[PDB]
Amino acid sequence: LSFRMSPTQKETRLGEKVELQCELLQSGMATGCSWLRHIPGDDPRPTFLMYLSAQRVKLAEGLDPRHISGAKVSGTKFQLTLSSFLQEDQGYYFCSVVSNSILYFSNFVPVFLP
Amino acid sequence: LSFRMSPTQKETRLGEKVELQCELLQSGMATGCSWLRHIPGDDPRPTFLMYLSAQRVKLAEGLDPRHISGAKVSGTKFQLTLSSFLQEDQGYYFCSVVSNSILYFSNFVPVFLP
């Protein structure tokens, strides 16, 4: 499964809104999509952020919905929004879709401060 | 020494990721591999893009790792990735390997816009 990322990278600033989108290049394989991010550090694992579908956005435990959310824009377009960028928001953002029990990952989007 | 290219060709779009792979079909001949490009026009010469190996990717001087990179992914498989396709990324991509002072070249992979 292929995705197009809009934008493909972002240099942001503290306090700024950041809006990311991933677009599935094929439809009908899933109704939902997850956003994840990898935080630079010694832990190589990604961090689950949210699951987006026809239902309300489901945020990862402990996340502030005032700060981070997302939306299913269409059957193939998914959006993530950071309302006011914080230092800890820096990382590599990507989408994941499960289809036929296979985890697929979009390309990653580096979102960093100067 | 022969190469297998995956894919053999690609029609891309602006802002899409492009991932190419070339696999050496004979083991034990080289542990490194170069990606080159040919663009018809004013300079027919093979243009060096990167040398992949056990070491970090060695990009040609002037290339931006935020746009172009690659990786050695097995003993024989080598990959080139464009993060966001640009008009200027169009052309014929191919791999080259040296073994016992003998230069080898893969088939050309056309990567173009509609």
Author numbering:
A (entry chain A), B (entry chain B): 2 to 115
Text lifted from the article:
CD8 is expressed on the T-cell surface as dimers in two isoforms, the CD8αα homodimer and the CD8αβ heterodimer; both consist of an extracellular immunoglobulin variable (IgV) domain, a stalk region, a transmembrane domain and a cytoplasmic tail. Our results suggest that although CD8α and MHC I sequences change drastically during co-evolution, a few conserved key residues ensure that the CD8α forms dimers and interacts with p/MHC I during at least the co-evolution of endotherm species.
The sheets of CD8α are composed of 10 β strands, but there are 11 β strands in sCD8α and bCD8α because their A and G strands are divided into two separate parts. The two artiodactyl CD8αα dimers also have some distinct structural characteristics, and the most notable feature is that they have an additional A’ strand. The two artiodactyl sCD8αα can be discriminated from each other by certain characteristics, such as the longer A’ strand and shorter complementarity determining region 2 (CDR2) loop in sCD8αα. The buried surface areas (BSAs) of cCD8αα, sCD8αα, bCD8αα, mouse CD8αα (mCD8αα), rhesus macaque CD8αα (rCD8αα) and human CD8αα (hCD8αα) are 828.3 Å2, 979.6 Å2, 928.7 Å2, 1048.7 Å2, 1105.5 Å2 and 1026.3 Å2, respectively, indicating that they are tightly binding dimers. The Q residue on the C strand is involved in the formation of hydrogen bonds in five CD8αα dimers, but it was substituted by H in bCD8α, and no hydrogen bond is formed at this location in bCD8αα. The numbers of residues composing the cCD8αα, sCD8αα and bCD8αα cavities are 7, 7 and 9, and their volumes are 202.0 Å3, 322.9 Å3 and 384.6 Å3, respectively.
